[PDB]
Design an enzyme around this catalytic site. Sequence first.
Site, mmCIF file in Angstrom:
data_model
loop_
_atom_site.group_PDB
_atom_site.id
_atom_site.type_symbol
_atom_site.label_atom_id
_atom_site.label_comp_id
_atom_site.label_asym_id
_atom_site.label_seq_id
_atom_site.Cartn_x
_atom_site.Cartn_y
_atom_site.Cartn_z
ATOM 1 C CB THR A 1 17.226 -30.345 23.930
ATOM 2 O OG1 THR A 1 15.864 -30.259 24.379
ATOM 3 C CG2 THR A 1 17.569 -31.802 23.738
ATOM 4 C CG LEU B 1 38.665 -19.344 35.872
ATOM 5 C CD1 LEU B 1 39.765 -19.888 34.964
ATOM 6 C CD2 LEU B 1 38.203 -20.408 36.867
HETATM 7 C C1 LIG Z 1 35.020 -25.485 34.137
HETATM 8 O O1 LIG Z 1 35.920 -26.600 33.919
HETATM 9 C C2 LIG Z 1 36.797 -26.469 32.789
HETATM 10 C C3 LIG Z 1 37.609 -27.764 32.571
HETATM 11 O O2 LIG Z 1 38.502 -27.915 33.700
HETATM 12 C C4 LIG Z 1 37.700 -25.252 32.987
HETATM 13 O O3 LIG Z 1 38.229 -24.872 31.710
HETATM 14 C C5 LIG Z 1 39.627 -25.037 31.591
HETATM 15 O O4 LIG Z 1 40.258 -23.853 32.071
HETATM 16 C C6 LIG Z 1 41.688 -23.728 31.881
HETATM 17 C C7 LIG Z 1 42.069 -22.270 32.184
HETATM 18 O O5 LIG Z 1 41.321 -21.401 31.292
HETATM 19 C C8 LIG Z 1 42.144 -24.147 30.459
HETATM 20 O O6 LIG Z 1 43.574 -24.272 30.435
HETATM 21 C C9 LIG Z 1 44.155 -23.736 29.216
HETATM 22 O O7 LIG Z 1 44.337 -24.785 28.231
HETATM 23 C C10 LIG Z 1 44.996 -24.466 26.988
HETATM 24 C C11 LIG Z 1 45.108 -25.753 26.170
HETATM 25 O O8 LIG Z 1 43.740 -26.022 25.872
HETATM 26 C C12 LIG Z 1 43.442 -27.171 25.049
HETATM 27 O O9 LIG Z 1 43.508 -28.435 25.762
HETATM 28 C C13 LIG Z 1 42.409 -28.782 26.650
HETATM 29 C C14 LIG Z 1 42.635 -30.157 27.285
HETATM 30 O O10 LIG Z 1 42.597 -31.192 26.288
HETATM 31 C C15 LIG Z 1 41.065 -28.700 25.894
HETATM 32 O O11 LIG Z 1 39.959 -29.131 26.705
HETATM 33 C C16 LIG Z 1 40.863 -27.280 25.331
HETATM 34 O O12 LIG Z 1 39.562 -27.182 24.717
HETATM 35 C C17 LIG Z 1 39.034 -25.829 24.603
HETATM 36 O O13 LIG Z 1 39.238 -25.238 23.300
HETATM 37 C C18 LIG Z 1 38.495 -25.768 22.169
HETATM 38 C C19 LIG Z 1 38.317 -24.612 21.207
HETATM 39 O O14 LIG Z 1 39.611 -24.038 20.976
HETATM 40 C C20 LIG Z 1 37.075 -26.295 22.464
HETATM 41 O O15 LIG Z 1 36.737 -27.405 21.623
HETATM 42 C C21 LIG Z 1 36.787 -26.675 23.929
HETATM 43 O O16 LIG Z 1 35.373 -26.587 24.103
HETATM 44 C C22 LIG Z 1 37.526 -25.770 24.937
HETATM 45 O O17 LIG Z 1 37.010 -24.411 24.810
HETATM 46 C C23 LIG Z 1 36.842 -23.679 26.052
HETATM 47 O O18 LIG Z 1 38.098 -23.377 26.719
HETATM 48 C C24 LIG Z 1 38.956 -22.342 26.160
HETATM 49 C C25 LIG Z 1 40.215 -22.153 27.023
HETATM 50 O O19 LIG Z 1 41.121 -23.256 26.819
HETATM 51 C C26 LIG Z 1 38.151 -21.042 25.954
HETATM 52 O O20 LIG Z 1 38.944 -20.008 25.362
HETATM 53 C C27 LIG Z 1 36.885 -21.333 25.125
HETATM 54 O O21 LIG Z 1 36.077 -20.169 25.019
HETATM 55 C C28 LIG Z 1 36.022 -22.399 25.796
HETATM 56 O O22 LIG Z 1 35.541 -21.825 27.025
HETATM 57 C C29 LIG Z 1 42.055 -26.898 24.400
HETATM 58 O O23 LIG Z 1 41.933 -27.488 23.085
HETATM 59 C C30 LIG Z 1 46.337 -23.758 27.229
HETATM 60 O O24 LIG Z 1 46.813 -23.267 25.976
HETATM 61 C C31 LIG Z 1 46.213 -22.598 28.241
HETATM 62 O O25 LIG Z 1 47.537 -22.104 28.536
HETATM 63 C C32 LIG Z 1 47.717 -20.660 28.420
HETATM 64 O O26 LIG Z 1 47.530 -19.924 29.651
HETATM 65 C C33 LIG Z 1 48.478 -20.285 30.707
HETATM 66 C C34 LIG Z 1 48.171 -19.588 32.029
HETATM 67 O O27 LIG Z 1 48.368 -20.571 33.064
HETATM 68 C C35 LIG Z 1 49.975 -20.168 30.342
HETATM 69 O O28 LIG Z 1 50.739 -21.004 31.224
HETATM 70 C C36 LIG Z 1 50.274 -20.639 28.917
HETATM 71 O O29 LIG Z 1 51.464 -19.958 28.488
HETATM 72 C C37 LIG Z 1 49.142 -20.340 27.908
HETATM 73 O O30 LIG Z 1 49.221 -18.940 27.599
HETATM 74 C C38 LIG Z 1 49.530 -18.799 26.198
HETATM 75 O O31 LIG Z 1 48.322 -18.670 25.424
HETATM 76 C C39 LIG Z 1 47.565 -17.466 25.665
HETATM 77 C C40 LIG Z 1 46.266 -17.569 24.865
HETATM 78 O O32 LIG Z 1 46.538 -18.180 23.586
HETATM 79 C C41 LIG Z 1 48.456 -16.250 25.314
HETATM 80 O O33 LIG Z 1 47.809 -14.987 25.531
HETATM 81 C C42 LIG Z 1 49.777 -16.284 26.112
HETATM 82 O O34 LIG Z 1 50.574 -15.129 25.787
HETATM 83 C C43 LIG Z 1 50.518 -17.642 25.959
HETATM 84 O O35 LIG Z 1 51.109 -17.838 24.657
HETATM 85 C C44 LIG Z 1 45.474 -23.032 29.538
HETATM 86 O O36 LIG Z 1 46.247 -23.919 30.379
HETATM 87 C C45 LIG Z 1 41.447 -25.408 29.908
HETATM 88 O O37 LIG Z 1 41.679 -25.570 28.491
HETATM 89 C C46 LIG Z 1 39.930 -25.324 30.113
HETATM 90 N N1 LIG Z 1 39.310 -26.564 29.647
HETATM 91 C C47 LIG Z 1 38.114 -26.616 29.055
HETATM 92 C C48 LIG Z 1 37.633 -27.988 28.647
HETATM 93 O O38 LIG Z 1 37.458 -25.600 28.842
HETATM 94 C C49 LIG Z 1 36.903 -24.041 33.462
HETATM 95 O O39 LIG Z 1 37.853 -23.047 33.852
HETATM 96 C C50 LIG Z 1 35.888 -24.318 34.558
HETATM 97 N N2 LIG Z 1 35.097 -23.111 34.790
HETATM 98 C C51 LIG Z 1 34.984 -22.600 36.034
HETATM 99 C C52 LIG Z 1 34.148 -21.350 36.217
HETATM 100 O O40 LIG Z 1 35.515 -23.149 36.998
HETATM 101 CA CA LIG Z 2 39.237 -13.832 35.185
HETATM 102 ZN ZN LIG Z 3 11.985 -28.878 23.556
#
Ligand SMILES: *[C@@H]1O[C@H](CO)[C@@H](O[C@@H]2O[C@H](CO)[C@@H](O[C@@H]3O[C@H](CO[C@H]4O[C@H](CO)[C@@H](O)[C@H](O[C@H]5O[C@H](CO)[C@@H](O)[C@H](O)[C@@H]5O[C@H]5O[C@H](CO)[C@@H](O)[C@H](O)[C@@H]5O)[C@@H]4O)[C@@H](O)[C@H](O[C@H]4O[C@H](CO)[C@@H](O)[C@H](O)[C@@H]4O[C@H]4O[C@H](CO)[C@@H](O)[C@H](O)[C@@H]4O)[C@@H]3O)[C@H](O)[C@H]2NC(C)=O)[C@H](O)[C@H]1NC(C)=O
Ligand SMILES: [Ca+2]
Ligand SMILES: [Zn+2]
Length: 802
Positions: free
Chosen positions: A159, A686
């Site tokens: 749900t 990805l």
């Molecule tokens: C389905 O659609 C969704 C939405 O479009 C897609 O997911 C996106 O994918 C992107 C790539 O993974 C990702 O971009 C990253 O964002 C980071 C900033 O993130 C914050 O801001 C956003 C926007 O407001 C927010 O939505 C995020 O929320 C996540 O995190 C919190 C928990 O912490 C949760 O409440 C929320 O549910 C969500 O969690 C999910 O996403 C994260 C990934 O962000 C997962 O880990 C979780 O498990 C969960 O799935 C955030 O609050 C930003 O920091 C990233 O940048 C890093 O990487 C790039 C590479 O380009 C680099 O330029 C930067 O330097 C940076 O690297 C540095 O950090 C690394 C790790 O710490 C480190 O190793 C390095 O050395 C560097 O220091 C990145 O740009 C985006 O956040 C998510 N969005 C969502 C909502 O999930 C998804 O891909 C689609 N799926 C498919 C199959 O298509």
């Molecule tokens: Ca991958």
């Molecule tokens: Zn039910």
Amino acid sequence: WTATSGSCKGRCFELQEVGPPDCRCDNLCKSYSSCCHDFDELCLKTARGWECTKDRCGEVRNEENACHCSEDCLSRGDCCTNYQVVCKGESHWVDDDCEEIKVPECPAGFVRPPLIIFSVDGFRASYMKKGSKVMPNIEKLRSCGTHAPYMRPVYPTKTFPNLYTLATGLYPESHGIVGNSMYDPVFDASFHLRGREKFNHRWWGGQPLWITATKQGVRAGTFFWSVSIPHERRILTILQWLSLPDNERPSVYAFYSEQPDFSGHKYGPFGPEMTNPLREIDKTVGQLMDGLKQLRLHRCVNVIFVGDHGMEDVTCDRTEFLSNYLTNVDDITLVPGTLGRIRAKSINNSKYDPKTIIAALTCKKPDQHFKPYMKQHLPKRLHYANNRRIEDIHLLVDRRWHVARKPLDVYKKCFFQGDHGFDNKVNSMQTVFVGYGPTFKYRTKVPPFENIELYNVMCDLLGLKPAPNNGTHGSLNHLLRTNTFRPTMPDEVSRPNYPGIMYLQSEFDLGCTCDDNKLEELNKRLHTKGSTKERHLLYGRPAVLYRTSYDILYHTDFESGYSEIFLMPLWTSYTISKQAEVSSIPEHLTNCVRPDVRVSPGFSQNCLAYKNDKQMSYGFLFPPYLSSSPEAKYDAFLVTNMVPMYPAFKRVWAYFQRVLVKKYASERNGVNVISGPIFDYNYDGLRDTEDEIKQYVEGSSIPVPTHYYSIITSCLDFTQPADKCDGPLSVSSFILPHRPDNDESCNSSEDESKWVEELMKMHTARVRDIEHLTGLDFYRKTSRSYSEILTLKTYLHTYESE
Ligand SMILES: *[C@@H]1O[C@H](CO)[C@@H](O[C@@H]2O[C@H](CO)[C@@H](O[C@@H]3O[C@H](CO[C@H]4O[C@H](CO)[C@@H](O)[C@H](O[C@H]5O[C@H](CO)[C@@H](O)[C@H](O)[C@@H]5O[C@H]5O[C@H](CO)[C@@H](O)[C@H](O)[C@@H]5O)[C@@H]4O)[C@@H](O)[C@H](O[C@H]4O[C@H](CO)[C@@H](O)[C@H](O)[C@@H]4O[C@H]4O[C@H](CO)[C@@H](O)[C@H](O)[C@@H]4O)[C@@H]3O)[C@H](O)[C@H]2NC(C)=O)[C@H](O)[C@H]1NC(C)=O
Ligand SMILES: [Ca+2]
Ligand SMILES: [Zn+2]
Ligand SMILES: Nc1ncc(-c2ccc(C(F)(F)F)cc2)nc1Br
Ligand SMILES: [Br-]
Ligand SMILES: [Cl-]
Ligand SMILES: [K+]
Ligand code: NA
């Protein structure tokens, strides 16, 4: 602490929620035990029931009444929903012939048609047909509006995961609600249906529709209703908000029903006690539409009728117990029921090994009713791995069954006859969609689509720009009369090289060996210049959407985009007509690998690495079996057509290429096939960059794929051959995991005809899934509209019966 001693006078169902300790009068206050002392009295009136009668007509207004039959009530927006029917001779909405709504017919001062989301828990897709005699209001919506035969939920088919996907457009792995029950290691907190912690905001990621509306200046009704607020009161509240002045009136609303899920759990999906809840739901729809008709809003508002998941027959006797498999059953925690998630009871326990647990759960009983997985080995179509809240060990449970830890768990809780939560491709888990209003089409049936696509459409209906999400915006344009979103194809980031003959045979030192006239020499050169390319590349070359360095390679039978970085094709394209014949690999060519004189030794694989690597062998992307002539067969043995394969996976691949490609070419009147490798070492769904690759063929820079894909395209009108198709296309695709054993398939020591096609069906995929995983964009050059191509790319062939 609440100062529950403030008051609700003039505040009933307040749209802005107020901050503790001042008391609350919003539709969620009950759930927080925080309502004002007088909430029940002023906001939950019941006096005199829910309907006008003859005697009540033009009565003197009595504020104590649940709803009103007096004269002024229409202005006030608080009449009983049947007031005009009983007191003014009007007909019910269900009794009116339906008439096309070409344009919004709204009162002055509405800036946009409002949107009402009517959501129903556990409304299984087949109730539309099976319950049709007892649901005349819903049947009118369905037949007069736009409808799908069913809608696909997300996994798990629970749900909260599903409601929150509807709200956000996101996979559970991205939005964070990965279950009804959850443990988060970073917070060291648990999330449960009973309790307080689910109210905390850190659980809920993405941006749900109500927040998207508010941020962009579109006012929203509160979406959530406390369970004790009766349905009639939810309806009357919504009708009331709709009567507010233009500056305060919300543009988007939700109703929610607990039914039919609640009764479904107790009685099974088709229990005879199920008729009544369906009747009650239809009655509620009737009340809404009659109420809208009174306010002259029934040809103004868009109405979405949507479910979260279906319901399946499940009883206590169909339980598998882990205590029948594991001797260590007390060192594990299980999240139980229609799916299994296993972690260690205690992280201080250094004796806990997921590998030995998996092995003990694998193919142990002849009709075992669940299958264990590392989460990264789950079918890619489920998108269920990339969250720290999803345990490394997962159990996919057969439809109709439960998994539990110990027998005590079940009989110390038989009660239930319905449950849900299984694989989202299972028929009984399918749910509903009906759209009705000025923005939807008239009397239109649309094909089945996934619930991740709806957020974009609700944004379109409200003129909002959607937050980034997992829908493919435009893939649902065919549901809409207007307000369509016209996207453009992404631009190509890397252009290809087209290398000619630049290297001599003897420049190659690869440890590879192979035992190998002007008329037919001009011939083979034009084949290499791309003369048959229009036969093998039917829809254009795929666009590479990232920065990399690659070559287009032409051949008589196939064309490929060869990656100099990964040392293999990103993609290989070929057409197999209905009449094509399968041959075998000749003996003189068994172990033949040939240098490609267009590609430098330094950008080539080598045989010596495969010889050294004891675990790893090789296969071909274009199958030699399907060569169009003995001379063209040599092209198939080029080192640039080669990819790394485990011997266990070769059994899969060889059967697909030798037997199934020809089978589909006969059934479909030719097929186009595009095949390639996928690298997803961090299981985020990805494309990996090169620095993300965890495994190479021993002693070389040859990266090992995690998966192999194929996209199989033909003419929807199968009387036309695949290469001469005039209309819409037909696709099925797969993402097969590249595994060193066949443990996933319990029958694998039998002949491939008994298990391979079953495995492929399990690993069925959308073209869109393959795009995320490769960074490629397919179907660039067709005669079809782009929206239609977006719909084709989101198609999933599920292999379930009707
Ligand atoms: C389905 O659609 C969704 C939405 O479009 C897609 O997911 C996106 O994918 C992107 C790539 O993974 C990702 O971009 C990253 O964002 C980071 C900033 O993130 C914050 O801001 C956003 C926007 O407001 C927010 O939505 C995020 O929320 C996540 O995190 C919190 C928990 O912490 C949760 O409440 C929320 O549910 C969500 O969690 C999910 O996403 C994260 C990934 O962000 C997962 O880990 C979780 O498990 C969960 O799935 C955030 O609050 C930003 O920091 C990233 O940048 C890093 O990487 C790039 C590479 O380009 C680099 O330029 C930067 O330097 C940076 O690297 C540095 O950090 C690394 C790790 O710490 C480190 O190793 C390095 O050395 C560097 O220091 C990145 O740009 C985006 O956040 C998510 N969005 C969502 C909502 O999930 C998804 O891909 C689609 N799926 C498919 C199959 O298509
Ligand atoms: Ca991958
Ligand atoms: Zn039910
Ligand atoms: N009690 C409840 N009251 C409302 C909802 C709800 C959830 C999602 C949506 C949707 F579809 F817009 F996202 C609408 C309503 N769920 C529960 Br549980
Ligand atoms: Br929710
Ligand atoms: Cl769960
Ligand atoms: K080997
Ligand atoms: Na096996």
